[PDB]
Amino acid sequence: NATEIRASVGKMIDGIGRFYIQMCTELKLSDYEGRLIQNSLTIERMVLSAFDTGGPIYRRVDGKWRRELILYDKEEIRRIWRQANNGDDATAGLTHMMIWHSNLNDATYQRTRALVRTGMDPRMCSLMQGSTLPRRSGAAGAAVKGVGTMVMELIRMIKRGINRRTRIAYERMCNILKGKFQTAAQRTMVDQVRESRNPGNAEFEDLIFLARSALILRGSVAHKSCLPACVYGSAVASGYDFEREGYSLVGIDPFRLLQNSQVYSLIRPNENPAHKSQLVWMACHSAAFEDLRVSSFIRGTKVVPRGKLSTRGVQIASNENMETMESSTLELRSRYWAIRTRSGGNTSDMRTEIIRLMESARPEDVSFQGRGVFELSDEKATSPIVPSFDMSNEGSYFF
Amino acid sequence: NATEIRASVGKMIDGIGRFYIQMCTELKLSDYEGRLIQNSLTIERMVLSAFDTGGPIYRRVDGKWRRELILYDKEEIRRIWRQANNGDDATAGLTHMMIWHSNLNDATYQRTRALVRTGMDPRMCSLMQGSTLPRRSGAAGAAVKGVGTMVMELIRMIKRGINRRTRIAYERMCNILKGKFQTAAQRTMVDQVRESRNPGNAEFEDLIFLARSALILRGSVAHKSCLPACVYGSAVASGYDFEREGYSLVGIDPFRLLQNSQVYSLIRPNENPAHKSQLVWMACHSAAFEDLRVSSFIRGTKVVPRGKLSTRGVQIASNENMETMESSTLELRSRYWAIRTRSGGNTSDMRTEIIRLMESARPEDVSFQGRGVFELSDEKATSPIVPSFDMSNEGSYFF
């Protein structure tokens, strides 16, 4: 059923577009200045703030870039927003940029300080997908969350409490949690946790276990390709009428759109452009915890690890100066595309059950058997391509 | 703020109108045959069923009335509906006819069999407002519910249980419950009830108490003037564009609309027309438990009690025959109008507190001090009129 799902989400994409265009028309920005991922970000956040303000806005004068600090009627923003969505709320829409930000943050930063202070192992990076994503996120907003993400929450919710209506949350938060797991025991053990009203260290220690079980017996976590507002604004302005022509966040749509996007970015004096583009590209698909090998394979070019990456962050801090600042054109095109999946793959004390399953598991264990990559011409999911990694690679752990 | 509230509800009224018109255009009914509250009902239910089918449709041939038994694509109905509401769901709209039905049922029938089988006193009629109203009803759907209505639910929910997620319901169902009460103890005692996870006869017996407290220290229950689909259909067709001109369910709007409505009804051989109109009129304003004195005052004419009412029900059963069947024009006009209110008025063991309050209360205790009735010219709430009941009345208890 390509009617609702493909076209209803198109309608949510149209809104973001239209809005971005309106909002650019207010700031009286130029074309080059509306394609500046920097300005786009600021706008996106102005809105999510107002629906739950001012921000940094960069301008282009003969030669150099001028940063403007501006403020807008928090309500005016809310007004312009609905105008674009037919006076609707389109929570989906706000939630969408709510994720684009997430996926950018899960790739720009490593959230160790928080994991440890929670009592999670810092090496549990690949499980913190969407830890930045405000709880306000929608129902299809949490589905993108990693197993580890959920645990950091419950553990804090529990840690302060064990240190009224709050209950329905906890059970559900677990049901979701449990719905991440895709194996008997995994599933069953979550229940054994959800049994206690005042779950103390008993649980505190057990979920942490299950957290680690997912490192081997992963769960189902959806990935959503959420592009910057400018990309959708520009597309809408170019005539693309997505609600009519349909759009996806896990199909070929997002890659294809990024195959023509003209996004620019501010870039510090010593930073590497190629390295900058990489970053953004990984935020456009929630590939911050993907196997670098595959990311590079699909990308078309080296996908260098975080450490070796030359950049501190896409947003420009108030600290920096504009004199020594310039801007490059972001390389967001990719070689092939792939169905962003949700599945994690698979081959007494319920712990034992898992520990026993954990064991038989080898890192070499092939997942998504038969699934492959698609050419950018292959609109339909017709012919798949299987990658062979016998190759001089460059790692697998972005972090 | 007469923008959203007055115009957004207008938009929900337009939908019902437009839809009714479309649906009449399918059945290829006539003008007289679209004004037949009978047919209107059937249509309204066809829809609520499909959004959660066929029905009885009466036709007019030379002289006599022909009943057609027809069926429609449950989805077709859902299709035509959205078409009218801009492809929206307009739950409000369905919920609206969800109430019109309610308010008609709370006046056509007395629901004793159910109260007693629940363990409520049959004399608690005036507290069962909206007992027929499906739980599917919306949030502004339950606000119309009487205190007694809520109790019959919890008591059954509790009775079968005490005989998972079901919990958040119970607490909320009480919070609503509690939000009906408008006095300290009343409010506090509800909490003392909401304390038990498995509330047994302890609660079973206590709420029943609180049920009876409302007979004296009433709560806040909203009343919504919800007219039959035909009335809105006809109005929409006559040009009235409510979303633009605004509409209310507790103002002068509904009375004014009914001041020009041409609604017809099927009427059995021995039934009294004047008596029939009365019924419908009381369902148009949720006046089934109002003081007959006031109902007649505002009505303009005698509002006779249920027993002395000549009619069995507005819908025609499959049992009856058409040969001995005819139809009259319903008198729905009223003398004055009044702001349909929500307020119930006011002047160790928390029981004691109430019982002590209960006591000081006299039936003669004046409520809505200063509030009056408005002429049908008095569009604004400008000049109020105070009724003096020194008069040869005809009772106060419709039941």
Side-chain angles (χ1 to χ4, degrees), chain A residues 24-36:
Chain A
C24 288
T25 299
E26 310 285 58
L27 287 297
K28 349 229 152 171
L29 313 170
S30 61
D31 194 72
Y32 192 91
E33 288 182 300
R35 305 184 174 278
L36 197 71

Side-chain angles (χ1 to χ4, degrees), chain A residues 86 88 164-165 167-169 171-172 191 194-195, chain B residues 86 88 164-165 167-169 171-172 175 194-195:
Chain A
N86 263 66
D88 269 300
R164 320 252 186 180
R165 307 157 102 200
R167 176 59 175 183
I168 296 175
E171 320 192 4
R172 197 189 65 183
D191 271 301
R194 186 216 308 180
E195 210 57 319
Chain B
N86 263 66
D88 269 300
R164 320 252 186 180
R165 307 157 102 200
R167 176 59 175 183
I168 296 175
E171 320 192 4
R172 197 189 64 183
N175 280 66
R194 186 216 308 180
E195 210 57 319

Side-chain angles (χ1 to χ4, degrees), chain A residues 259-314:
Chain A
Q259 287 301 293
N260 294 70
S261 43
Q262 198 45 17
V263 190
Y264 314 108
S265 182
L266 298 174
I267 177 165
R268 293 183 284 281
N270 286 162
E271 318 195 292
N272 186 173
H275 270 52
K276 182 71 61 158
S277 296
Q278 179 189 305
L279 185 61
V280 182
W281 181 89
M282 305 171 84
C284 299
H285 322 108
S286 313
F289 301 121
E290 233 280 50
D291 181 323
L292 289 173
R293 294 191 289 171
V294 63
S295 305
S296 308
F297 175 67
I298 301 177
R299 209 279 180 91
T301 52
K302 318 182 183 174
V303 178
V304 167
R306 180 74 184 76
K308 294 286 191 284
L309 218 55
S310 294
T311 171
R312 301 198 204 199
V314 175

Side-chain angles (χ1 to χ4, degrees), chain B residues 14 17-18 21 31 35 230-242 245 257 260-262:
Chain B
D14 297 355
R18 293 209 229 82
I21 292 169
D31 194 72
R35 305 184 174 278
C230 62
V231 172
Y232 300 152
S234 184
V236 175
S238 303
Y240 286 109
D241 209 283
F242 298 93
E245 326 177 355
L257 196 59
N260 294 70
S261 43
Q262 198 45 17

